[PDB]
Enzyme design. Structure first.
Site, PDB file in Angstrom:
ATOM      1  N   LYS A   2      -6.483  70.834  69.037  1.00 14.37           N
ATOM      2  CA  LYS A   2      -5.844  69.612  69.626  1.00 14.37           C
ATOM      3  C   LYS A   2      -5.374  68.911  68.397  1.00 14.37           C
ATOM      4  O   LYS A   2      -5.949  69.195  67.301  1.00 14.37           O
ATOM      5  CB  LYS A   2      -6.929  68.913  70.430  1.00 14.37           C
ATOM      6  CG  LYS A   2      -7.089  69.489  71.834  1.00 14.37           C
ATOM      7  CD  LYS A   2      -7.839  68.628  72.822  1.00 14.37           C
ATOM      8  CE  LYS A   2      -7.166  68.674  74.210  1.00 14.37           C
ATOM      9  NZ  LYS A   2      -6.099  67.621  74.261  1.00 14.37           N
ATOM     10  N   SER A   5     -13.206  76.505  80.658  1.00 20.81           N
ATOM     11  CA  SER A   5     -12.827  75.383  79.784  1.00 20.81           C
ATOM     12  C   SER A   5     -12.648  74.094  80.619  1.00 20.81           C
ATOM     13  O   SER A   5     -12.398  74.152  81.830  1.00 20.81           O
ATOM     14  CB  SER A   5     -11.559  75.564  78.955  1.00 20.81           C
ATOM     15  OG  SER A   5     -10.425  75.575  79.805  1.00 20.81           O
ATOM     16  N   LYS A  26      -7.388  79.038  70.033  1.00 23.42           N
ATOM     17  CA  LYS A  26      -6.337  79.208  71.016  1.00 23.42           C
ATOM     18  C   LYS A  26      -5.152  78.320  70.740  1.00 23.42           C
ATOM     19  O   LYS A  26      -5.346  77.140  70.432  1.00 23.42           O
ATOM     20  CB  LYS A  26      -6.975  78.707  72.345  1.00 23.42           C
ATOM     21  CG  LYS A  26      -6.005  78.547  73.492  1.00 23.42           C
ATOM     22  CD  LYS A  26      -6.403  77.331  74.353  1.00 23.42           C
ATOM     23  CE  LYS A  26      -5.505  77.313  75.587  1.00 23.42           C
ATOM     24  NZ  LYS A  26      -5.200  75.883  75.883  1.00 23.42           N
ATOM     25  N   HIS A  46      -3.047  82.324  80.115  1.00 24.21           N
ATOM     26  CA  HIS A  46      -3.330  80.911  80.449  1.00 24.21           C
ATOM     27  C   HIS A  46      -2.744  80.636  81.790  1.00 24.21           C
ATOM     28  O   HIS A  46      -1.652  81.141  82.157  1.00 24.21           O
ATOM     29  CB  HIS A  46      -2.810  79.985  79.371  1.00 24.21           C
ATOM     30  CG  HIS A  46      -3.161  78.554  79.684  1.00 24.21           C
ATOM     31  ND1 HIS A  46      -2.561  77.763  80.624  1.00 24.21           N
ATOM     32  CD2 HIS A  46      -4.161  77.798  79.107  1.00 24.21           C
ATOM     33  CE1 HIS A  46      -3.142  76.598  80.599  1.00 24.21           C
ATOM     34  NE2 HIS A  46      -4.105  76.588  79.718  1.00 24.21           N
ATOM     35  N   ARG A  47      -3.459  79.818  82.616  1.00 18.24           N
ATOM     36  CA  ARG A  47      -2.991  79.591  83.996  1.00 18.24           C
ATOM     37  C   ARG A  47      -2.168  78.348  84.280  1.00 18.24           C
ATOM     38  O   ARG A  47      -1.988  77.996  85.465  1.00 18.24           O
ATOM     39  CB  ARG A  47      -4.102  79.799  85.047  1.00 18.24           C
ATOM     40  CG  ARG A  47      -5.262  78.815  84.903  1.00 18.24           C
ATOM     41  CD  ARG A  47      -6.149  78.987  86.119  1.00 18.24           C
ATOM     42  NE  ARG A  47      -7.138  77.919  86.108  1.00 18.24           N
ATOM     43  CZ  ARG A  47      -8.068  77.630  87.045  1.00 18.24           C
ATOM     44  NH1 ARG A  47      -8.183  78.459  88.090  1.00 18.24           N
ATOM     45  NH2 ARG A  47      -8.869  76.558  86.859  1.00 18.24           N
ATOM     46  N   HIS A  76      -8.053  82.036  82.133  1.00 15.76           N
ATOM     47  CA  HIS A  76      -8.584  80.695  82.291  1.00 15.76           C
ATOM     48  C   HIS A  76      -8.839  80.589  83.834  1.00 15.76           C
ATOM     49  O   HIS A  76      -8.055  80.835  84.766  1.00 15.76           O
ATOM     50  CB  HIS A  76      -7.607  79.597  81.899  1.00 15.76           C
ATOM     51  CG  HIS A  76      -7.613  79.323  80.428  1.00 15.76           C
ATOM     52  ND1 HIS A  76      -8.127  78.196  79.871  1.00 15.76           N
ATOM     53  CD2 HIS A  76      -7.132  80.078  79.393  1.00 15.76           C
ATOM     54  CE1 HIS A  76      -7.998  78.280  78.531  1.00 15.76           C
ATOM     55  NE2 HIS A  76      -7.345  79.355  78.229  1.00 15.76           N
ATOM     56  N   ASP A 136      -2.134  76.212  72.060  1.00 13.85           N
ATOM     57  CA  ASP A 136      -1.963  75.448  73.296  1.00 13.85           C
ATOM     58  C   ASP A 136      -0.993  76.255  74.154  1.00 13.85           C
ATOM     59  O   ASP A 136      -0.118  76.908  73.538  1.00 13.85           O
ATOM     60  CB  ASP A 136      -1.391  74.058  72.955  1.00 13.85           C
ATOM     61  CG  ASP A 136      -1.434  73.292  74.303  1.00 13.85           C
ATOM     62  OD1 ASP A 136      -0.488  73.406  75.082  1.00 13.85           O
ATOM     63  OD2 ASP A 136      -2.523  72.693  74.392  1.00 13.85           O
ATOM     64  N   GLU A 137      -1.098  76.185  75.465  1.00 14.67           N
ATOM     65  CA  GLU A 137      -0.154  76.907  76.306  1.00 14.67           C
ATOM     66  C   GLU A 137       1.271  76.423  76.097  1.00 14.67           C
ATOM     67  O   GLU A 137       2.207  77.146  76.449  1.00 14.67           O
ATOM     68  CB  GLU A 137      -0.449  76.697  77.785  1.00 14.67           C
ATOM     69  CG  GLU A 137      -0.740  75.260  78.194  1.00 14.67           C
ATOM     70  CD  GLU A 137      -2.080  74.705  77.880  1.00 14.67           C
ATOM     71  OE1 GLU A 137      -2.841  75.255  77.059  1.00 14.67           O
ATOM     72  OE2 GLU A 137      -2.448  73.684  78.485  1.00 14.67           O
ATOM     73  N   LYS A 149      -2.378  68.837  71.510  1.00 14.62           N
ATOM     74  CA  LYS A 149      -1.592  69.900  72.152  1.00 14.62           C
ATOM     75  C   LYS A 149      -0.215  70.130  71.487  1.00 14.62           C
ATOM     76  O   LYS A 149       0.221  71.296  71.483  1.00 14.62           O
ATOM     77  CB  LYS A 149      -1.298  69.785  73.630  1.00 14.62           C
ATOM     78  CG  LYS A 149      -2.490  69.399  74.501  1.00 14.62           C
ATOM     79  CD  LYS A 149      -1.846  69.044  75.866  1.00 14.62           C
ATOM     80  CE  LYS A 149      -1.325  70.300  76.580  1.00 14.62           C
ATOM     81  NZ  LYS A 149      -2.565  71.202  76.682  1.00 14.62           N
ATOM     82  N   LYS A 190     -19.278  70.485  89.433  1.00 15.36           N
ATOM     83  CA  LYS A 190     -18.729  70.996  90.685  1.00 15.36           C
ATOM     84  C   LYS A 190     -19.894  71.176  91.647  1.00 15.36           C
ATOM     85  O   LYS A 190     -20.966  71.655  91.241  1.00 15.36           O
ATOM     86  CB  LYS A 190     -17.979  72.316  90.490  1.00 15.36           C
ATOM     87  CG  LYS A 190     -16.862  72.195  89.458  1.00 15.36           C
ATOM     88  CD  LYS A 190     -15.624  71.465  89.949  1.00 15.36           C
ATOM     89  CE  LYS A 190     -14.474  72.400  90.278  1.00 15.36           C
ATOM     90  NZ  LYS A 190     -14.942  73.803  90.552  1.00 15.36           N
ATOM     91  N   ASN A 220       8.939  83.962 102.160  1.00 18.35           N
ATOM     92  CA  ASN A 220       9.541  83.113 103.152  1.00 18.35           C
ATOM     93  C   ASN A 220       8.678  82.308 104.124  1.00 18.35           C
ATOM     94  O   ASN A 220       9.251  81.273 104.569  1.00 18.35           O
ATOM     95  CB  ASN A 220      10.497  83.999 104.024  1.00 18.35           C
ATOM     96  CG  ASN A 220      11.595  84.525 103.108  1.00 18.35           C
ATOM     97  OD1 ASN A 220      12.332  83.737 102.474  1.00 18.35           O
ATOM     98  ND2 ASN A 220      11.704  85.848 102.972  1.00 18.35           N
ATOM     99  N   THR A 256     -10.514  75.106  71.100  1.00 15.94           N
ATOM    100  CA  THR A 256      -9.171  74.599  71.485  1.00 15.94           C
ATOM    101  C   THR A 256      -8.685  73.692  70.370  1.00 15.94           C
ATOM    102  O   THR A 256      -9.459  72.805  69.977  1.00 15.94           O
ATOM    103  CB  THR A 256      -9.132  73.870  72.864  1.00 15.94           C
ATOM    104  OG1 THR A 256      -9.561  74.844  73.895  1.00 15.94           O
ATOM    105  CG2 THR A 256      -7.774  73.335  73.237  1.00 15.94           C
TER     106      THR A 256
END
Lengths: 123, 441, 133, 441, 441, 123
Positions: E149, E353, E175, E268-269, E301, E177-178, E151, E308, E97, E147
């Site tokens: 592809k 990734s 993997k 997977h996030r 993930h 795909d999510e 997707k 960065k 809340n 990965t």
């Protein structure tokens, strides 16, 4: 436009929507049983005039279907009057009872007829 | 035409079929009949077995009187061809391929003789006539059902309200439309619950056992069983199935379920007219009716006799007998091509519906007798005073008829009179009779 | 013949049917087509709901070329009439009763347009062509 | 930017999305919108299929009036991208990755057009508005719920005592705090049992059906189902779930369970403000609400309008319509970016809560109308005379408002007066109104 | 502001939270912090219990250096508030809340201290790092994933073909795909079967254990379990779940399932950026990561560090430690607000990734060390020679880096050189490096 | 401080917490139904004025929800007075009955209104 009452219209199966059978109407019904060769039999009940479900509620189970036998099925009776007599006998004895006449077709081993012959006061 | 065997002596275990054949111009009957039998049953693998043991055989031809190009070809199939307890398999074997045989203009299966040795492999009706009257405690008169209209678009709660109103008036059953399964406007569980509430209330009020045919017809066997399961949990007496659209495999599963759990099964014949209407092509309703009695159902919609010529009324009565009785002697006048012995498989109650009005009560009673359910739509729902009064109207009309009959009156001669006298003491009945009274009286 | 509605604009979710109708001598096509639709889909309970929402409607007639007594009557049924994922129910609703309507000599269902909103309620083939190869 | 396709003609089966985009300084809108679509949907494997068939495409940009750096990018996704009946999968596909695209300062999903061909793959609400009023037999007025406070630390037996007191006073529902699951101070089975005892007692006392939202939210799907199972055994009407914290996969399982067992499902929106508060980033509550109607719930906490500017009250009403109605025409004034046709999927009852007082009754009635539940915490529990009286207070306040409205009074003009007159004959109401009476009168 | 308790001495069993608060102009911090705590945890019923026992309390405020309107409010919640083993309930209670409290402009949860007495109520990862290397027999180097592809839109059989090609080249995992769950273009059972065929073939060929993350994410818990069941029947090592879209309740059920059946769980996030991107509002990914380690997953993930800034690389490393280690000492430089003791709950392998190229290998190795999975899309699939060669390229690049490191070389100083030397003897690697070689060399 | 009575406060849903509607209040309600185009209908009950659970106790099952229909829904009625009349008719007939007025919205196929119009002595 009239409203069918939701109270005080308790029924008893065949013929219970017609005006109470008269001694002659009654007799006519008894004779029909006799004409077709069914065995008449009286049944009466004093407590549960209607079906209920106390012991069980599975499909097809109901309490109160069976009533008490008045004497024995009237094998070989030939006079619809004997039958009416018994009815008379039964009401003097149990003026509070519901009395119905039933008829057996033993060739098919079924109850081929069942109508109320007398209801207690207020029914 | 090793398939046309007029010398053949049918066996007690044979399945016999009466096909109404309309051969292609040129092809003789005998050839006709031999072709029905040939790919209606039946290289080297051929010599690995005995043809003669598994072949259907046309042991008899008959010219249809009146018509041109029509015979009645009689085919015999060995017991061994059939999977025990499977109407699906009886149908695949007999009617699976021949209706498309080039050489036939049209073919119509009219009858089948199901031998006792095959009948005994079926459970038949979950309960049957006798058991149902006893469970319901109803004897001495046809049973009365009410049809809830409209057919689609009613809410679960309004469904039950109409169900309660119709039952509390004197009718024994209410019926789900064959189309109501589970839909956006009314999901099945909601309907079951509300109908259960409504039938118990009407039962408690009148003192008479009530039932509502809860339709369990569904997309899959699992879903159909899941619906009957809830009806069982609710403790209600009867469920319903559309045997031809659901299919024989499902119906046989539901009829077993009903036997095992004490539920009566009301069968609706939706789609039948697609197959049984045309006189030269298809499967006569009497064959569809024997199949139902075999697969199982306690009730079956059989049409109405209301406004049917006597020859028609007769064909109807022939299939009624086939549904209810234990033994039916051959009778072409009524369309019974083979004597059918049911070796004690329970009988099914014929359900009459379609345009029945109270002034039709005398005839219906007369024609069907006590072992039938008379179903009314417009007669109940359509009464000027609503469902209950509508219900009284039919119930008194029916009772007047039974009493009359019981007193020795002729329902056929005095129908109008009996109805008319009842109107004198049943306002409800009186209201239902006004347009008719004007025309006949 | 509140069931013959040539003005009707079919919806993307409608189930449409093409019936080959052979009317009984006397009965007009429009009446024909309105009867196919009328007890192919549909008192006081009637006023507890909306007819118009659940009615099949014949929005179109067509004379079969060559033949006598034959039309192609086009009927539209609302999505709501049908139980999702149930071919049994589609069949009961469309072909359950009309083939026995007195007023028709013969009737033949020729085609149905299954809308995408109904197709999506079915699994369809366990695998289908591509998966099987 | 083969992803920006202004020529594109959306299909009836497309899923459309309205994204509120705040591009990084420099990047054009068209590029913006093409990036939302590009990794919101989509090498050699690429040539093994057809891009064009599975690509999301931005067929339209729009500059947000007022603001700087904001557009409304409209994206179309093919039906095929989505797993039937899976809100989890709709969400993964649309909002799974783009919110983290470098090139966007912020992104907010504002609306989705769920096509009828996808809506039909969901069960939707176990029951929905109409079925729930009918099961509860409550018509003609908003439903009233009471909030049991404190939020944590109450014992199972004290929970039920407050539940019974609050219900016997005129409220229809009591609610478990979204946080009460099973804890050291109160294990779930104990709460369920005591609440059941309390709601039956309040039902028996008042003659009105009662419900307590029993929270089944749990750590695992198995445990959540185990809790709804006991609510089913107890015969109670409603269970509760925190759909966002439990998650869509669990919620869809519980909503199915509820459908199959006749339980109403009350949904709490805990955690929503984490995602839907910020105007430039997130998912607007209207999208979370369509998803709930799809996954399933019979009720959903929608906030309160109490003290909200009209522009806000409007956005609220837009999502209320989306929750309850069958068809909602596009309306940007109310934040409805796409016309939404629900093809008869049941509607959800909006649940209004948060600082509601009896003197707010007139407006709430007015704004939401009958199809809503008004929930009170401090208004019931907080009444000077306890829960029951607190309950009477709200129930008479509500009834005064409905009657007034029904008589043609203007709730917006006469709110205070209507309340005030009711106080004249409801002590209970009078006690609840004293601090307010002083300020306004 | 009985909720601001600077005197308070946190208990070893308390759950502590660090909220980044941006108060509404006017409201003091202390009031800020007391409001976060007040309806983040908590009339007469109030006196039926003890407030003091179940109240969250703000025992500390801190001004965020640099910024205006921001503090770090530290809240303590009693152990008793939480349902054992339920991340759903921890989340409902803490973040349910307050994010919508009027008085806050924005709120961001940055960290939580999960006490050992609560950690012990969770199973945590089905297996965790150590068990997984041992089951896979892989030690001494980061694990490599490929990965697949595009997707969406690939067929089950083409999926497996790309899976086999990518694995036979030296990668450990492939993997799903999510977004790939079950769809018209590829139903799940077909994918599982083909992928299983492909991973066994690649295993048999190379002699190294392979895995394919089979996505079990689904609409309902039942369907999700049904998918993991088939992966179990096929004997494969790992399944996958989208924990935020599926939800914590489902994830906890699948993680239990995995423990009970020996399956590794790859998490997977998807959707995280919706909640954790904005610095003033939401839930920091480190909180989402502790929750995953609690609910359970063997892999998660975590983003990429590629390009960065160091301050970012640091925050990342802080949450990596929190995922993998047993004890993490408080460290604000890295965004670790509380010392976290995991009392032997297994560690999760971070999955890196997003735009990783072979020339990024040295840094990744360097930053993450051996206990990580590096996932490549365009690096494998995107290689000029196809998936296998693409796979060799990454595998030799990785191995060159590990060897170098093992020899004492500085990956940070010699990255380019190490890569570059490997290219000398790996054509495959050479082909992957050509555009980069031109720019740097 | 007053105590809400646990006895003798039986309710009937919408508007049952307000003082008994007066002939005019009643009429106003009927008119509202009419203004919105709902179809009024009377329902009455003489035995079970309140919900109970005899036949079943599964979720959502209750006995006593349904009452008896008084005549038919009043399609096309245009005068709220016709309705009040019926109420009058109903009470003379069943002075012991509970009488409620209901209104149907057939566009949505729902009951959009339901209030008690008359309660027997002692309620």
């Amino acid at each position: 436009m009239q409203v069918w009452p939701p109270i005080n219209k308790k029924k008893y199966e065949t013929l219970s929507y017609l005006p109470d059978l008269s001694q002659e109407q009654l007799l006519s019904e008894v004779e029909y049983l006799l004409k077709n060769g069914w065995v008449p039999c009286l049944e009466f009940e004093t407590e549960h005039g209607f079906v209920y479900r106390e012991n069980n509620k599975s499909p097809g189970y109901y309490d109160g279907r069976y009533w008490t036998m008045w004497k024995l099925p009237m094998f070989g009776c030939t006079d619809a009057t004997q039958v009416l007599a018994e009815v008379e006998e039964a009401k003097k004895a149990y003026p509070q009872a519901w009395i119905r006449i039933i008829g057996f077709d033993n060739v098919r081993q079924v109850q081929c007829i069942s109508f109320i012959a007398y209801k207690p006061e207020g029914y | 035409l090793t398939y046309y065997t007029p010398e053949y002596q049918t066996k007690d275990t044979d399945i016999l079929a009466a096909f109404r054949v309309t051969p292609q111009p040129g092809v003789p009957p005998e050839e006709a009949g031999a072709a029905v039998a040939a790919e209606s049953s039946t290289v080297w693998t051929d010599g690995l077995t005995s043809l003669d043991r598994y072949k259907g055989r046309c042991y008899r031809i008959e010219r249809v009187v009146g018509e041109k190009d029509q015979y009645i070809a009689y085919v015999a199939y060995p017991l061994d061809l059939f999977e025990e307890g499977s109407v699906t398999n009886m149908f695949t074997s007999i009617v699976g391929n021949v209706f498309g045989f080039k050489a036939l203009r049209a073919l119509r299966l009219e009858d089948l003789r199901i031998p006792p040795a095959y009948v005994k492999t079926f459970q038949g009706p979950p309960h049957g006539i006798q058991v149902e009257r006893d469970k319901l405690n109803k004897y001495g008169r046809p049973l009365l059902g009410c049809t809830i209209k409209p057919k689609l678009g009613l809410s679960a709660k309004n469904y039950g309200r109409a169900v309660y109103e119709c039952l509390r008036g004197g009718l024994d059953f209410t019926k789900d439309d064959e189309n109501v399964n589970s839909q956006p406007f009314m999901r099945w569980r909601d309907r079951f619950l509300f109908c259960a509430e409504a039938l118990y209330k009407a039962q408690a009020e009148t003192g008479e056992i009530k039932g509502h045919y809860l339709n369990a017809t569904a997309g899959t066997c699992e879903e159909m069983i899941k619906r009957a399961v809830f009806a069982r949990e609710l403790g209600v007496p009867i469920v319903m199935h559309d045997y031809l659209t659901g299919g024989f495999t499902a119906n046989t599963s539901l009829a077993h379920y009903c036997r095992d759990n004490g539920l009566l099964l009301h069968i609706h014949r939706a789609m039948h007219a697609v197959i049984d209407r045309q006189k030269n092509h298809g499967i006569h309703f009497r064959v569809l009716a024997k199949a139902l009695r075999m697969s199982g159902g306690d009730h079956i919609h059989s049409g109405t006799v209301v406004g049917k010529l006597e020859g028609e009324r007769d064909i109807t009565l022939g299939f009624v007998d086939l549904l209810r009785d234990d033994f039916v002697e051959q009778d072409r006048s009524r369309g019974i091509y083979f004597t059918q012995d049911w070796v004690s498989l329970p009988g099914v109650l014929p359900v009459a519906s379609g345009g029945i009005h109270v002034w039709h009560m005398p005839a219906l009673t007369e024609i069907f007798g006590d072992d039938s359910v008379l179903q009314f739509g417009g007669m109940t729902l359509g009464h000027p005073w609503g469902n209950a009064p509508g219900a009284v109207a039919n119930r008194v009309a029916l009772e007047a008829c039974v009493k009359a009959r019981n007193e020795g009156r002729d329902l056929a001669q005095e129908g109008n009179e009996i109805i008319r006298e009842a109107c004198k003491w049943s306002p409800e009945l009186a209201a239902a009779c006004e347009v008719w009274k004007e025309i006949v009286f």
